[PDB]
Amino acid sequence: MTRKDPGSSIWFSLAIDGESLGYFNGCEGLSTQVEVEQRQEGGNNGFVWQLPTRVTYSNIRLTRPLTPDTAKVAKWISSVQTGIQRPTAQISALRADGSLVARWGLIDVLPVSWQGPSLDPGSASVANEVLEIAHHGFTD
Amino acid sequence: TSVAAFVGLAPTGPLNEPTLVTNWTQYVAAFGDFTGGYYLAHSVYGFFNNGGSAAYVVRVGGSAQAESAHPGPAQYLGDSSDRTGFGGLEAIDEISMVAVPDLMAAYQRGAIDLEAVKAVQLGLIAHCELMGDRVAIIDPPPNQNARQIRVWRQETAGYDSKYAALYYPWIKSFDPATGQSRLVPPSGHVAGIWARNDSERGVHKAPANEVVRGAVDLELQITRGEQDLLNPIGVNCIRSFPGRGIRVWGARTLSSDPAWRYLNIRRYFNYLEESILIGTQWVVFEPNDHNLWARIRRNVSAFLVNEWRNGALFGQSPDQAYYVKCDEETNPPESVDLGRVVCEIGIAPVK
Numbered sequence: 127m128t129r130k131d132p133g134s135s136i137w138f139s140l141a142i143d144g145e146s147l148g149y150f151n152g153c154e155g156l157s158t159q160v161e162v163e164q165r166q167e168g169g170n171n172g173f174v175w176q177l178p179t180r181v182t183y184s185n186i187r188l189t190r191p192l193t194p195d196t197a198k199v200a201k202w203i204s205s206v207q208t209g210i211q212r213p214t215a216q217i218s219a220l221r222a223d224g225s226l227v228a229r230w231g232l233i234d235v236l237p238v239s240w241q242g243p244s245l246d247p248g249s250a251s252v253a254n255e256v257l258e259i260a261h262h263g264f265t266d
Numbered sequence: 267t268s269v270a271a272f273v274g275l276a277p278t279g280p281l282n283e284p285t286l287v288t289n290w291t292q293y294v295a296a297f298g299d300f301t302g303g304y305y306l307a308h309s310v311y312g313f314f315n316n317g318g319s320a321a322y323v324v325r326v327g328g329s330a331q332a333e334s335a336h337p338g339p340a341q342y343l344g345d346s347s348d349r350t351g352f353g354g355l356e357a358i359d360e361i362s363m364v365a366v367p368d369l370m371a372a373y374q375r376g377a378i379d380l381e382a383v384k385a386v387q388l389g390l391i392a393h394c395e396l397m398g399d400r401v402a403i404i405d406p407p408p409n410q411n412a413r414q415i416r417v418w419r420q421e422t423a424g425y426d427s428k429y430a431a432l433y434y435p436w437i438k439s440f441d442p443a444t445g446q447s448r449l450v451p452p453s454g455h456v457a458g459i460w461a462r463n464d465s466e467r468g469v470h471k472a473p474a475n476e477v478v479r480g481a482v483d484l485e486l487q488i489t490r491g492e493q494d495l496l497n498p499i500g501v502n503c504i505r506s507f508p509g510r511g512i513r514v515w516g517a518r519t520l521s522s523d524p525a526w527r528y529l530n531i532r533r534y535f536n537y538l539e540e541s542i543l544i545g546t547q548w549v550v551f552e553p554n555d556h557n558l559w560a561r562i563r564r565n566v567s568a569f570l571v572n573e574w575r576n577g578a579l580f581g582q583s584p585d586q587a588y589y590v591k592c593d594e595e596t597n598p599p600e601s602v603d604l605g606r607v608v609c610e611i612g613i614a615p616v617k
Binding site: 207 | 582
């Protein structure tokens with residue numbers, strides 16, 4: 127309606143709650159899979175039965191420019207020894223108008239990896255720390 | 267970390283030269299064995315028998331001015347001559363503990379007044395308070411009686427220093443040569459325990475509740491009720507627990523500062539302070555700037571974290587163990603030379 131409201135992939139909003147990680151800048155790999163189990167019906171050539179089995183959510187790689195607030199994520203990651211906290215996370219896609227297209231949320235999170243900046247005297251870019259994040263489920 | 271220092275009279279051997287010995291047979295080859303009734307020979311033997319492979323001895327007296335300020339119960343600083351009095355120990359930077367066996371054989375023999383022997387102990391304390399790493403062990407008047415030693419500590423001496431340990435009741439040690447019980451001060455024997463500690467459980471564990479092996483009997487046995495009027499004030503004790511031999515009870519230093527009461531903390535810090543200053547030897551070298559102050563912070567941190575690895579620190583994680591700060595804030599631009607300042611922490615006390 128009204129020449130539609132087509133989704134886009136440049137406007138967004140990425141954030142983690144709880145620990146002061148703030149708002150991120152890029153996302154990748156947001157995906158849900160179901161591990162099907164294949165059974166070969168012996169007496170009937172022509173296909174292989176497909177039966178669903180469980181649902182699995184893959185990890186997400188979130189990136190942002192390296193800012194002095196990177197001391198928080200390093201502290202959060204190294205808090206496993208004394209107890210960790212899993213705040214809810216939000217991944218949303220937006221149009222240029224700033225109106226919601228489809229807002230996902232991560233029920234419970236967990237650090238997995240933190241690929242720090244790739245310092246280089248030659249390459250002209252900006253340091254992009256990478257914070258891999260685990261997953262539990264989509265909120266509704 | 268464990269080597270000991272002793273000052274006393276002993277027949278023959280070099281005079282006022284702090285020689286090094288590592289075994290009892292090495293000692294007897296230099297300064298006799300029990301001849302003349304000098305207490306240094308017994309005290310070293312108790313130390314060697316009670317573990318401890320290193321020992322420094324400063325012979326001052328001689329066989330027979332048998333006893334005086336410098337000669338006999340040595341007290342003079344020697345005018346920093348590196349060859350007289352407690353100044354001989356100044357050029358060592360290895361000795362971690364000092365004791366005075368003969369200091370009070372003169373008191374028994376009457377050659378030194380009680381007011382005269384107070385000063386030399388205090389002079390010894392000033393020595394420990396100067397070098398900043400060694401700890402001195404102090405011994406009380408013989409046959410002092412329990413109800414009177416508490417008066418003696420708080421009225422006669424009143425040392426109140428963070429480098430002194432006191433152990434009240436003497437020891438009736440056993441001489442293997444003659445098999446006769448003799449009375450000796452516990453300065454040598456207690457030092458043996460402190461040597462076992464580092465070589466068996468590290469400096470972390472306070473040197474107490476260990477067998478004073480070498481001992482036979484204790485004069486003026488102390489009951490528990492009498493001890494509770496002694497332990498808090500800063501006096502240790504030795505008791506004969508039934509079926510468990512002779513054990514050292516109490517690990518309190520001779521200080522009134524509530525934060526330095528326990529022995530191991532002072533024992534720990536001297537080990538801790540001496541460990542890093544041996545390590546971080548960037549002095550009269552490496553330009554004082556905003557770069558070096560960052561270098562120091564990492565080097566100290568990379569050591570304390572490793573010290574938390576063996577226990578002996580609190581926090582469940584390295585971040586809550588120490589707190590270092592060597593940034594531009596602590597070094598003002600005015601500090602052109604008197605610079606390179608830093609802070610640090612360590613704590614794991616005992617019961």
